[PDB]
Amino acid sequence: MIKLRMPAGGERYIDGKSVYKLYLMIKQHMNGKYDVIKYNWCMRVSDAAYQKRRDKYFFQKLSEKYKLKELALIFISNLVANQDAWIGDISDADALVFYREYIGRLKQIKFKFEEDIRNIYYFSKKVEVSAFKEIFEYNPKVQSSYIFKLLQSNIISFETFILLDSFLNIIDKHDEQTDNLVWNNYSIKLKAYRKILNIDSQKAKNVFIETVKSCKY
Ligand SMILES: [Cl-]
Ligand SMILES: [Cl-]
Ligand SMILES: [Cl-]
Ligand SMILES: [Cl-]
Ligand SMILES: [Cl-]
Ligand SMILES: [Cl-]
Ligand SMILES: [Cl-]
Ligand SMILES: [Cl-]
Ligand SMILES: [Cl-]
Ligand SMILES: [Ir+4]
Ligand SMILES: [Ir+4]
């Protein structure tokens, strides 16, 4: 149903500067300044900028131990879900600890998706929607939506939001109806992550329908 797109030759070990380049390309991608898929996980960087770094040891240590696929996951998981890495330096974000905790989450994505769907459904009853669709539609009054609010409160994950988006078109519709800064900040990350996620919309839809049905009856 869902797979993360990854740089080619993921079993490879690379050097410290290369680890730094990988981090920078993913960082820029998550900020909407680059597209790792468009450029096939390759990017040129400023050596002067790298040399100016006071934390070159961080990238060196990671390079000694982790394969390319693991390095990519460490950076992706942190830059997507670790708010401490959204603006703060990766060498200051407790990245490895965060990554270890996040890989376990990625391994159970389908179960987590189902869990999130059930929670979205029961929440919809608590707020007394007149129709389930009201949860996902942008609300001009509050410049937001219940589904976005749930993501903000960390009740559901980014993967769940993007999975729902695959067949509900939530992100693009929100983007066209508002300029809200808070949404935009999240939307930049959502669209960036969506680019590296390979999602089978039909399968995600099937899971959604089956899960809601089990909540209703
Ligand atoms: Cl599958
Ligand atoms: Cl599947
Ligand atoms: Cl599957
Ligand atoms: Cl499957
Ligand atoms: Cl399947
Ligand atoms: Cl399957
Ligand atoms: Cl109606
Ligand atoms: Cl309607
Ligand atoms: Cl309506
Ligand atoms: Ir499957
Ligand atoms: Ir209507």
mmCIF file of C-alpha atoms and ligand atoms in Angstrom:
data_model
loop_
_atom_site.group_PDB
_atom_site.id
_atom_site.type_symbol
_atom_site.label_atom_id
_atom_site.label_comp_id
_atom_site.label_asym_id
_atom_site.label_seq_id
_atom_site.Cartn_x
_atom_site.Cartn_y
_atom_site.Cartn_z
ATOM 1 C CA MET A 1 0.000 0.000 0.000
ATOM 2 C CA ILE A 2 2.820 2.391 0.812
ATOM 3 C CA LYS A 3 6.575 2.423 0.284
ATOM 4 C CA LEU A 4 9.180 5.141 0.713
ATOM 5 C CA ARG A 5 11.100 5.976 -2.445
ATOM 6 C CA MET A 6 14.814 5.646 -1.714
ATOM 7 C CA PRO A 7 18.147 6.554 -3.298
ATOM 8 C CA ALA A 8 19.527 3.807 -5.551
ATOM 9 C CA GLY A 9 22.161 1.446 -4.145
ATOM 10 C CA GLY A 10 20.879 1.622 -0.587
ATOM 11 C CA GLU A 11 23.182 -1.094 0.763
ATOM 12 C CA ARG A 12 26.239 1.078 0.079
ATOM 13 C CA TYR A 13 28.489 2.708 2.645
ATOM 14 C CA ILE A 14 29.573 6.271 1.839
ATOM 15 C CA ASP A 15 31.927 8.873 3.307
ATOM 16 C CA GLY A 16 31.307 11.734 5.729
ATOM 17 C CA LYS A 17 30.950 14.503 3.179
ATOM 18 C CA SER A 18 28.540 12.321 1.204
ATOM 19 C CA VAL A 19 26.409 11.831 4.319
ATOM 20 C CA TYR A 20 26.351 15.614 4.710
ATOM 21 C CA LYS A 21 25.282 16.002 1.060
ATOM 22 C CA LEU A 22 22.489 13.472 1.559
ATOM 23 C CA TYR A 23 21.246 15.324 4.645
ATOM 24 C CA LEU A 24 21.345 18.694 2.868
ATOM 25 C CA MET A 25 19.476 17.434 -0.181
ATOM 26 C CA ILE A 26 16.750 15.866 1.974
ATOM 27 C CA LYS A 27 16.592 18.980 4.157
ATOM 28 C CA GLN A 28 16.084 21.208 1.128
ATOM 29 C CA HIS A 29 13.566 18.759 -0.309
ATOM 30 C CA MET A 30 11.522 18.855 2.906
ATOM 31 C CA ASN A 31 11.603 22.680 2.728
ATOM 32 C CA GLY A 32 10.300 22.622 -0.848
ATOM 33 C CA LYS A 33 13.599 23.926 -2.239
ATOM 34 C CA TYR A 34 14.672 20.749 -4.021
ATOM 35 C CA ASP A 35 13.110 17.568 -5.394
ATOM 36 C CA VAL A 36 15.160 14.459 -4.692
ATOM 37 C CA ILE A 37 12.980 12.439 -7.054
ATOM 38 C CA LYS A 38 13.290 14.891 -9.933
ATOM 39 C CA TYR A 39 17.078 14.834 -9.498
ATOM 40 C CA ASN A 40 17.377 11.157 -8.592
ATOM 41 C CA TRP A 41 18.879 11.767 -5.134
ATOM 42 C CA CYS A 42 21.857 13.691 -6.492
ATOM 43 C CA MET A 43 22.738 17.275 -5.670
ATOM 44 C CA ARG A 44 25.804 19.460 -5.785
ATOM 45 C CA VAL A 45 26.644 21.417 -2.642
ATOM 46 C CA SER A 46 28.898 24.317 -1.656
ATOM 47 C CA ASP A 47 32.152 22.980 -0.206
ATOM 48 C CA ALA A 48 32.726 26.327 1.479
ATOM 49 C CA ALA A 49 29.433 25.901 3.358
ATOM 50 C CA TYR A 50 30.329 22.351 4.386
ATOM 51 C CA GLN A 51 33.771 23.407 5.611
ATOM 52 C CA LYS A 52 32.166 26.179 7.658
ATOM 53 C CA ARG A 53 30.152 23.551 9.582
ATOM 54 C CA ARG A 54 31.199 23.142 13.225
ATOM 55 C CA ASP A 55 29.663 19.650 13.361
ATOM 56 C CA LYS A 56 31.410 17.760 10.561
ATOM 57 C CA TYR A 57 32.102 14.941 13.054
ATOM 58 C CA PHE A 58 28.368 14.145 13.166
ATOM 59 C CA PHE A 59 28.252 13.233 9.502
ATOM 60 C CA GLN A 60 31.553 11.377 9.824
ATOM 61 C CA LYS A 61 30.240 9.181 12.651
ATOM 62 C CA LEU A 62 27.041 8.364 10.762
ATOM 63 C CA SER A 63 29.056 7.460 7.645
ATOM 64 C CA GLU A 64 31.128 4.881 9.501
ATOM 65 C CA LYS A 65 28.154 2.881 10.723
ATOM 66 C CA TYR A 66 25.075 3.288 8.528
ATOM 67 C CA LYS A 67 24.290 2.138 4.999
ATOM 68 C CA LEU A 68 22.824 4.628 2.530
ATOM 69 C CA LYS A 69 19.266 3.332 3.013
ATOM 70 C CA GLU A 70 19.589 3.697 6.793
ATOM 71 C CA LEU A 71 21.097 7.185 6.445
ATOM 72 C CA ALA A 72 18.218 8.238 4.181
ATOM 73 C CA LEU A 73 15.666 6.950 6.713
ATOM 74 C CA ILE A 74 17.434 8.700 9.597
ATOM 75 C CA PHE A 75 17.225 12.026 7.764
ATOM 76 C CA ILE A 76 13.736 11.536 6.320
ATOM 77 C CA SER A 77 12.138 10.397 9.587
ATOM 78 C CA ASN A 78 13.684 13.328 11.467
ATOM 79 C CA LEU A 79 13.026 16.046 8.903
ATOM 80 C CA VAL A 80 9.413 14.957 8.492
ATOM 81 C CA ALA A 81 8.227 14.122 12.014
ATOM 82 C CA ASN A 82 10.913 15.555 14.310
ATOM 83 C CA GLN A 83 9.932 19.198 14.822
ATOM 84 C CA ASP A 84 13.282 19.765 16.522
ATOM 85 C CA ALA A 85 14.815 19.174 13.085
ATOM 86 C CA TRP A 86 12.326 21.302 11.139
ATOM 87 C CA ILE A 87 14.487 24.362 11.811
ATOM 88 C CA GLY A 88 17.174 23.186 14.243
ATOM 89 C CA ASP A 89 20.385 21.441 13.141
ATOM 90 C CA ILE A 90 20.257 17.682 12.646
ATOM 91 C CA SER A 91 23.315 17.208 14.870
ATOM 92 C CA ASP A 92 21.326 18.828 17.727
ATOM 93 C CA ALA A 93 18.032 16.967 17.201
ATOM 94 C CA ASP A 94 18.816 13.669 18.960
ATOM 95 C CA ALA A 95 18.292 12.223 15.478
ATOM 96 C CA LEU A 96 19.403 8.637 16.065
ATOM 97 C CA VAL A 97 17.119 8.176 19.053
ATOM 98 C CA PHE A 98 14.232 9.683 17.086
ATOM 99 C CA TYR A 99 14.987 7.497 14.066
ATOM 100 C CA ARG A 100 15.069 4.246 16.038
ATOM 101 C CA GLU A 101 11.641 5.097 17.449
ATOM 102 C CA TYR A 102 10.308 6.044 14.004
ATOM 103 C CA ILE A 103 11.446 2.937 12.084
ATOM 104 C CA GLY A 104 9.223 0.826 14.312
ATOM 105 C CA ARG A 105 6.342 3.086 13.304
ATOM 106 C CA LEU A 106 7.117 2.732 9.602
ATOM 107 C CA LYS A 107 7.100 -1.054 9.935
ATOM 108 C CA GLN A 108 3.479 -1.004 11.152
ATOM 109 C CA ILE A 109 2.077 1.671 8.830
ATOM 110 C CA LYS A 110 -1.041 -0.255 7.761
ATOM 111 C CA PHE A 111 -2.066 -1.022 11.342
ATOM 112 C CA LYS A 112 -1.379 2.585 12.317
ATOM 113 C CA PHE A 113 -3.454 3.786 9.341
ATOM 114 C CA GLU A 114 -6.350 1.605 10.503
ATOM 115 C CA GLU A 115 -5.944 2.857 14.077
ATOM 116 C CA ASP A 116 -5.961 6.479 12.907
ATOM 117 C CA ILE A 117 -9.047 5.927 10.731
ATOM 118 C CA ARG A 118 -10.995 4.487 13.671
ATOM 119 C CA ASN A 119 -9.943 7.421 15.829
ATOM 120 C CA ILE A 120 -10.941 9.902 13.118
ATOM 121 C CA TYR A 121 -14.340 8.217 12.881
ATOM 122 C CA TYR A 122 -15.071 8.257 16.613
ATOM 123 C CA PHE A 123 -13.853 11.857 16.806
ATOM 124 C CA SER A 124 -16.304 12.735 14.039
ATOM 125 C CA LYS A 125 -19.110 11.479 16.290
ATOM 126 C CA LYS A 126 -17.821 13.454 19.265
ATOM 127 C CA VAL A 127 -17.920 16.697 17.262
ATOM 128 C CA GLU A 128 -21.293 15.651 15.830
ATOM 129 C CA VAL A 129 -20.628 16.056 12.131
ATOM 130 C CA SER A 130 -23.728 15.818 9.947
ATOM 131 C CA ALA A 131 -21.670 13.852 7.419
ATOM 132 C CA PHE A 132 -18.231 12.193 7.634
ATOM 133 C CA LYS A 133 -17.008 14.311 4.711
ATOM 134 C CA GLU A 134 -17.152 17.392 6.973
ATOM 135 C CA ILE A 135 -14.018 16.124 8.734
ATOM 136 C CA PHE A 136 -11.919 16.406 5.579
ATOM 137 C CA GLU A 137 -13.245 19.600 4.005
ATOM 138 C CA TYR A 138 -11.484 22.938 4.417
ATOM 139 C CA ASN A 139 -13.510 25.392 6.556
ATOM 140 C CA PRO A 140 -13.087 29.049 5.437
ATOM 141 C CA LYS A 141 -14.424 30.294 8.779
ATOM 142 C CA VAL A 142 -11.512 28.884 10.785
ATOM 143 C CA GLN A 143 -9.048 28.641 7.879
ATOM 144 C CA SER A 144 -8.569 24.975 8.732
ATOM 145 C CA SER A 145 -10.259 21.568 8.872
ATOM 146 C CA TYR A 146 -10.833 18.864 11.446
ATOM 147 C CA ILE A 147 -8.435 16.527 9.651
ATOM 148 C CA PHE A 148 -5.675 19.147 9.677
ATOM 149 C CA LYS A 149 -6.393 19.866 13.352
ATOM 150 C CA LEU A 150 -6.025 16.167 14.131
ATOM 151 C CA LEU A 151 -2.629 16.138 12.447
ATOM 152 C CA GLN A 152 -1.617 19.235 14.411
ATOM 153 C CA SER A 153 -2.569 17.547 17.681
ATOM 154 C CA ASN A 154 -0.504 14.527 16.651
ATOM 155 C CA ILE A 155 -3.572 12.281 16.925
ATOM 156 C CA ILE A 156 -2.822 10.987 13.412
ATOM 157 C CA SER A 157 0.469 10.694 11.536
ATOM 158 C CA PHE A 158 1.833 12.365 8.416
ATOM 159 C CA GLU A 159 1.686 9.009 6.635
ATOM 160 C CA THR A 160 -2.008 8.677 7.497
ATOM 161 C CA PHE A 161 -2.701 12.221 6.299
ATOM 162 C CA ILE A 162 -0.929 11.513 3.014
ATOM 163 C CA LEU A 163 -2.625 8.130 2.656
ATOM 164 C CA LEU A 164 -6.042 9.780 3.069
ATOM 165 C CA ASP A 165 -4.955 12.474 0.603
ATOM 166 C CA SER A 166 -4.195 9.840 -2.045
ATOM 167 C CA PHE A 167 -7.913 9.272 -2.655
ATOM 168 C CA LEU A 168 -9.500 12.327 -0.991
ATOM 169 C CA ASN A 169 -7.326 15.093 -2.503
ATOM 170 C CA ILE A 170 -7.092 16.990 0.813
ATOM 171 C CA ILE A 171 -3.756 18.772 0.410
ATOM 172 C CA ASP A 172 -4.319 20.337 -3.000
ATOM 173 C CA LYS A 173 -7.854 21.453 -2.108
ATOM 174 C CA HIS A 174 -6.606 23.073 1.099
ATOM 175 C CA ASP A 175 -3.768 24.755 -0.825
ATOM 176 C CA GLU A 176 -6.153 26.320 -3.346
ATOM 177 C CA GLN A 177 -8.541 27.667 -0.697
ATOM 178 C CA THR A 178 -6.141 29.379 1.709
ATOM 179 C CA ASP A 179 -2.860 31.192 2.329
ATOM 180 C CA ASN A 180 -2.897 30.509 6.070
ATOM 181 C CA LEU A 181 0.721 30.444 7.270
ATOM 182 C CA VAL A 182 0.224 27.620 9.768
ATOM 183 C CA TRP A 183 -1.285 25.377 7.086
ATOM 184 C CA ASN A 184 1.323 26.379 4.509
ATOM 185 C CA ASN A 185 4.189 25.420 6.837
ATOM 186 C CA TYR A 186 2.682 21.949 7.223
ATOM 187 C CA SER A 187 1.637 21.744 3.573
ATOM 188 C CA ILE A 188 5.218 22.271 2.449
ATOM 189 C CA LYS A 189 6.258 19.186 4.445
ATOM 190 C CA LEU A 190 3.174 17.225 3.414
ATOM 191 C CA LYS A 191 3.762 17.790 -0.290
ATOM 192 C CA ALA A 192 7.491 17.116 0.036
ATOM 193 C CA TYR A 193 6.904 13.822 1.872
ATOM 194 C CA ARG A 194 4.163 12.916 -0.603
ATOM 195 C CA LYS A 195 6.764 13.088 -3.399
ATOM 196 C CA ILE A 196 8.917 10.378 -1.835
ATOM 197 C CA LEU A 197 5.995 8.171 -0.788
ATOM 198 C CA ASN A 198 4.853 5.543 -3.288
ATOM 199 C CA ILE A 199 1.185 5.039 -2.471
ATOM 200 C CA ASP A 200 -1.392 2.777 -4.076
ATOM 201 C CA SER A 201 -4.482 4.991 -3.794
ATOM 202 C CA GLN A 202 -6.950 2.179 -4.448
ATOM 203 C CA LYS A 203 -5.503 0.001 -1.692
ATOM 204 C CA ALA A 204 -5.509 2.905 0.778
ATOM 205 C CA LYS A 205 -9.129 3.611 -0.201
ATOM 206 C CA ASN A 206 -10.118 -0.048 0.311
ATOM 207 C CA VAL A 207 -8.582 -0.051 3.794
ATOM 208 C CA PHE A 208 -10.394 3.199 4.602
ATOM 209 C CA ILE A 209 -13.792 1.871 3.464
ATOM 210 C CA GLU A 210 -13.371 -1.448 5.278
ATOM 211 C CA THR A 211 -12.215 0.229 8.494
ATOM 212 C CA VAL A 212 -15.067 2.737 8.560
ATOM 213 C CA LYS A 213 -17.538 -0.069 7.848
ATOM 214 C CA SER A 214 -16.267 -1.997 10.867
ATOM 215 C CA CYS A 215 -16.747 1.145 12.989
ATOM 216 C CA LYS A 216 -20.299 1.697 11.770
ATOM 217 C CA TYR A 217 -21.576 -1.873 12.090
HETATM 218 CL CL CL B 1 0.796 -3.871 -1.225
HETATM 219 CL CL CL B 2 -1.402 -3.426 0.773
HETATM 220 CL CL CL B 3 0.278 -4.914 2.395
HETATM 221 CL CL CL B 4 0.392 -6.307 -0.312
HETATM 222 CL CL CL B 5 -1.669 -6.148 -1.713
HETATM 223 CL CL CL B 6 -1.997 -6.470 1.048
HETATM 224 CL CL CL B 7 -25.711 18.086 1.479
HETATM 225 CL CL CL B 8 -22.924 16.943 -0.436
HETATM 226 CL CL CL B 9 -22.698 19.299 1.816
HETATM 227 IR IR IR B 10 -0.599 -5.238 0.228
HETATM 228 IR IR IR B 11 -24.163 19.421 0.367
#
